[model samples]
Target: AAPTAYTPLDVAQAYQFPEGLDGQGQCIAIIELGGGYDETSLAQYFASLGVSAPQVVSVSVDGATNQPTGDPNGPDGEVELDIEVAGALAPGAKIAVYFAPNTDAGFLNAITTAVHDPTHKPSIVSISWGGPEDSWAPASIAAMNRAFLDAAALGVTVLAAAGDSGSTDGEQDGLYHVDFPAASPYVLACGGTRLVASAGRIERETVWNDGPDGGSTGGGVSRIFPLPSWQERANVPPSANPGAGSGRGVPDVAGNADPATGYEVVIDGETTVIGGTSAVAPLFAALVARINQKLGKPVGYLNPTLYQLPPEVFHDITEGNNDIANRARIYQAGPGWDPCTGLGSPIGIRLLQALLP
Candidate 1:
């Protein structure tokens, strides 16, 4: 079934996001796998939404660029979703799309290139693709983490999707897992939620979980990384299945991601509805761009700073769980942070006031 599409204004009004902030002079870099996008479609889509198109540039990494061929439903859809969401939410922000092959080296080079891109020097980078932690080699993960560390030092915030297969991370290992790049403590891991809207208002938000067919939000502790000091006081729970032990918690924050309540995006000149933590990454990155524009400075490495803010800065999602495939109730939503939704979805304006001030 085709998912319903929610416009940026729909999300903004539902969450009471800030008004009159256009993310001026900020750039968001996007990492892609095997898809391509053209400016004509990009401009046309944004125009339909009554927003001016952003300055969009495509950078090739490892000989991958805007090669929009047959697979629009797969990687091509991903590319358009990332670009469309970022531009829609923050139309004034410049977008740098970094296309790379779906390989270890390609992913690594794409990130580093965006990190050090003096031309773009993006304030934030959004990554919407990832595999389970074990799917990546130790060397690649280590290199990526180092690149993220460098991003932090440069005052850039990197946001990665926390996968869509719940704690299993689409793995058949019969245990729990988290998605990489997201598991890296240096990056702000973005999770998903099912936002129940009633009469054009957000009724409630819960962890995005559907059975094996629909997939759920991915989360849980990281087996490879220790808990960062900022998270030490975060009351992070242990692994749901007890294999990873106490480790760095995934999903520093979350946003609307249920296909039943997904986003209206334009992909390959076609308007389509999409979901997954893929939506969360760009939405969150756009917010970060707004913050950067407001403060005239980048708030890099959000984990520490976001932890210090009052809980009121966010919308607490106290219901639902992301135990995919009806597996053990590995994780659940609660008053504060949890594996399902982390610190909960943002009250954008409030978050900006807290973060910038």
Candidate 2:
């Protein structure tokens, strides 16, 4: 057996996750383009966490089927990470994973299928794969955003990884950028943070910037999307926050995304540590499921509600930076909200209690 890594329960406890809410009567739909996971690996991971495996079903989109490459270093790692995180956190909820090709059409169709999935009826959708806003054709971005808007209207919450390349968003343009699907206004753009754990509580937190060890968290303002009504007040401080007022800001909220202090995921029967905002999406999605179970309804389109939350609901990360020297651009963290880590990481139990009854 491969060495066991930091498990979900370890992370849940570190962040003071809500207890006694097992995500019952809820469904979390995970969207993926390429890569697949086997039930056996998932079972091993869940068993290690001492929770029964939730129903794991596969929904194909654009003719893509369930196919695992068996390479933990590839997209399969992402697939396994997304599934195990959501399942482990919300053990009582069903997991409907949508697999599709890595094309724009496949990506968009997968979300649409999951939303209307008659059998699953997922109350929330978590997406781990995405690209920069410019990488996609304008039509494709519009179509995907339309799907997200539909999910909002249908009582489904959407969570997406802001990206792992910090403000550059994997581009060498010598300017700041954010990932798409996440940059869309309707989705809760999940950002990352570097965490320090002592015993079961977080010892320290900062903007995720591991540099070469692992990429820093991705964030910044969108060049295209104007600021939404909800974010108009926060504004991320235009002077310190780039792309501010230029467009809608990316990463409305954040969680742990540093591989140095990463998540425990078992892929290819080997336990490993994984990081990135990819892990953050599922972690938060599972929390949303539990919150829904308590409230007896889905908390859809979280942007408005999230923006209205008081400071007590969050643990503001007021330090660190996400600047890469490649372009000599720097986006540092400060009081209130900044692009590096959005509204900071959640207080878990406190956050849910604040959001729900």
Candidate 3:
């Protein structure tokens, strides 16, 4: 569904939404800090899926170039693919996508604008783009986290991708890692998982960062934001790797993110496959939309509650590792929360029904 190299639609299937949202109303706002949407490709794809033609509303954040490409400093591929795929998934869910510059200022501004968008119906916000936790200054990360705080107060759910790189975030530079925005305490930090399906039933699942040759798991310390309260007493080490901790923990949750087992999407008139945690963020947001439709109101700041629910509501991946030293050594996916796959992928109406007061 990510239509390119990342797949959000693949994630939708993991949750089982073949017909899309059939219930009430709720708009899912996807934040695209880079790249532009290919309208023609989108229309053609959805038509083939038999889902309703989507209404893609693109709102340009002031002071940013509107290119469907990532800038030099940030990764745009993940973001663009995610926005398109998520939009395709609950076609009836009014999609309000925001395109802002890939900077602390621009990113925060987009969140602020999305929160108070009077003309746009935004009850949930998904951020599929992110820079490393160490790449951002602490003060700056706090400012951005604050934006999520404001949106939460307004009853809007904000979600951000943890990152595609492993716990080391590639670690090629010899520095520590953890995706920013994901490190932020206010937002739900989404990680990645490699899922296997057989005869329509999930045969297996694992952490995604483990590349075929060089396993890349997304988890680690953040030089920026400190540990959030929810993570306390969870025995979450700074880094799953004893020696690689960057001081910030990661991955509040996860979903299918491996490219080989990626999502199938139709975009820009081309059928494509995509992967990475970028695909998971928006897909989760779309599912939240369906839950809200069932509940009849927007569910704001869900991070606090989602973590409290039972593990049976979703699948818990326990068979792969992405930590440092040996990619498999540091980051490992275990039952419940373990840095790698976090709480695992969604399973039934248990999560959907849990939304009511």
Candidate 4:
């Protein structure tokens, strides 16, 4: 298929994975909800990068089958987008993908299945779909939580797409909103941003995960889960008005997730453009792959270490924001680490090297 509006791959956005990652040999477990995987097509994607064949594996959950389909569920685009990009970024790492129906029950089971894979035994797993926090009942929350908790205890690291709804929860009929799994304290809540090229030193700037359209953000107050052990001082719930009202905070980290500036992805022979936190989750996952590659061990639990680092290793997004007028502070990018684009995108091989023991 011909190229679409989205670029195939933007290596300029830090495509410097070393040819030899010290031969650590690790697998990346990508979680998807819809879309099919054509090894031939995937091979073509890796070919574009001039990389070797990837050892890809597929696992099934609730669905009796998994393939590219126009009509699936809420997470189809997200699933396909994440898997497609992960394959491109980390060609050397074995890609293990698990697809579960986009349901409360289905998503929970899918996560558990991927985390507990016996043969593949992936070291890192990526999730790209989530719903509203309050909308998730205790049972649903517990199931998903149990699965990830198990992965944590088992020494596996997981990355979750914060949400596409914006800094706030989400918008109902053009209102504000946020997603659930992103709100989960256990997972790394990744937000979004747009990095436009400027000058020549790569000092470009701007922050806008939530475009003009009402979208999801990995922020807001969580009625269920309390702040994680690391961010207790962020003084979350940055006040509904910065002085009054209260809510949880989110977006532990962030990356490029704007569809207009989204990662290049192709599926079903027709390239479709997609954005939101969905892009950030998988892209971040690929970064984790490189970290694992050099570290010789999974870089588990990055939420704590990510903060100790300075801003030089990151590109701070200072301008723009995702706040829609009258809909609450759903999205907004400010001077530093506003729920929108936290800590900015990764820098050179610095983060990877630091992740190494």
Query: What are the Cα lDDT values of the candidates?
Result: 0.85, 0.84, 0.69, 0.64
Order of the predicted models by lDDT, top scorer first: 1, 2, 3, 4
TM-score of each: 0.96, 0.95, 0.87, 0.85
lDDT of 3 by residue, 1-357 (tens): 232233444446656653435423778787766667666666776776677766778888976644643231233445446656666666668888888887777888888888899999589888877787666777777788888888888899888888777766755665557787887777777887777764366766777754535345476556666666766644566654345444446777787777767777654445666667777787788777777777767878887787778766778778877754443466666666777766667763668756556
Off by over 4 Å in 2: 1-5, 237-245, 327-329
Model 1 Cα lDDT, one tens digit per residue, 94-120:
999998988989998999999899988
238-353, model 4: which lDDT tens digit per residue?
43434334454567777666665555555544455677777777676777777777765677767767777766666776566656445454446665556666666666476765
Which candidate leads in lDDT?
A: 1
> Candidate 3: RMSD over Cα atoms?
3.8
| TM value for model 1 | 0.96
Q: How many residue pairs clash in each candidate?
A: 1, 1, 20, 26
* lDDT for position 31 in model 1: 95
Q: Top TM-score: which candidate number? A: 1
Task: Using TM-score as the measure, name the better of candidate 3 and candidate 4.
Answer: 3
Which ranges in model 4 have alpha carbons more than 4 Å from their true place? 1-12, 15-24, 70-76, 173-176, 198-203, 209-216, 239-248, 325-331
